[PDB]
Design a protein around this ligand. Structure first.
Ligand SMILES: Nc1ncnc2c1ncn2[C@@H]1O[C@H](COP(=O)(O)OP(=O)(O)OP(=O)(O)O)[C@@H](O)[C@H]1O
Ligand SMILES: [Mg+2]
Length: 312
């Protein structure tokens, strides 16, 4: 029940400007401009974010959480669980409010057979609470997320009249993720290198790239741990960036001029000048990781919208 609002700006989510606008139109505008969405224009009660894994579903929700300017956010995932009655209640008071249930395929499991019988009233204590005997004409909106939506209950599914597809990133959005997940960190990557990576990642999810950048990111760290030699160098003081020093120590090879023998244990905590993440490190991280979303996965996703499409 994370009742908070993290730090994910729209700017942080690459691509998805379609879903962004969809979400601005059904979640932010209604809250900021009540009088617009009154009468016949009442925002749907439930939005569902479906689409392949690692394409932005949960992440997007966080963006909404922070960009949900006035309303307070509420979250849950795959986590005696009758205090669902408690959640909805909580929200009605702090209305306007948003309720986000990540992987709503949590509260479900059908091959058309497989049930934990007490979770049958879980489905129903939720299903019922969305109708509301005390009609919650509050700014209360229910968000859902899932990468296997077809497994949902007709009753549940049809509870989300607005359904948005979160796809695999187009090339442009791909390059932008590498850039971002790197950020304020020291590196030697050119705008050209980002495009080259974007181009080389045909078919990858956001989660996949997120893994790649984290790996390459860790390169200077592996090189410092494993090094056997360090050179004395010029660079920004660890304590004061705008004071250069002729003193830092960076890892190197023995076949290097100015190579002192020692390990990181010998380097003072405040004299290490770490290596920069290079494009070499990206491609290396890249080669050793392959796309997670296969075709049949994406195919079965076309199915879920086969006339299920909107509302039913
Ligand atoms: N559109 C995006 N913009 C920026 N980063 C992204 C994007 N999509 C995925 N990511 C990366 O992956 C992570 C978010 O993964 P996300 O929550 O979207 O996976 P998911 O969609 O919930 O997976 P699943 O669908 O299986 O539940 C972030 O840490 C981020 O680095
Ligand atoms: Mg998720």
């Amino acid at each position: 029940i994370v009742i908070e609002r993290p730090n994910v700006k729209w700017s942080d989510v690459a691509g998805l400007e379609g879903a962004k606008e969809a979400l601005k139109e059904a979640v932010i505008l209604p809250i900021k401009f009540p009088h617009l969405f009154t009468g016949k224009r009442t925002p749907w009660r439930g939005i569902l974010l479906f689409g392949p894994p690692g394409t932005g579903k949960s992440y997007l929700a966080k963006a909404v959480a922070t960009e949900a300017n006035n309303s307070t956010f509420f979250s849950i995932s795959s986590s005696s669980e009758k205090l669902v009655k408690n959640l909805f209640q909580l929200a009605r008071e702090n209305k306007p409010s948003i309720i986000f249930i990540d992987e709503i395929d949590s509260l479900c499991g059908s091959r058309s057979e497989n049930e934990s019988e007490a979770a049958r009233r879980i489905k129903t204590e939720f299903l019922v609470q969305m109708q509301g005997v005390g009609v919650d004409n509050d700014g209360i909106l229910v968000l859902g997320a899932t990468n296997i939506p077809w497994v949902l209950d007709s009753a549940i599914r049809r509870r989300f009249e607005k359904r948005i597809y979160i796809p695999l990133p187009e090339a442009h959005a791909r390059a932008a993720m590498f850039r971002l997940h790197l950020g304020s960190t020291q590196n030697s990557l050119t705008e050209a290198d980002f495009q080259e990576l974007g181009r080389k990642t045909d078919g990858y999810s956001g989660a996949d790239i997120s893994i790649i950048v984290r790996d390459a990111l860790m390169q200077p760290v592996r090189k410092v741990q494993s090094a056997t030699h360090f050179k004395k160098v010029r660079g920004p003081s660890r304590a004061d960036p705008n004071c250069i020093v002729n003193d830092l120590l960076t890892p190197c090879s023995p076949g290097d001029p100015g190579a002192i023998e020692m390990t990181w244990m010998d380097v003072p905590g405040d004299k290490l000048l770490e290596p920069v993440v290079s494009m070499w490190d990206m491609l290396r991280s890249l080669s050793s990781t392959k796309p997670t979303v296969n075709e049949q996965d994406l195919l079965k996703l076309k199915k879920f919208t086969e006339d299920f499409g909107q509302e039913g």
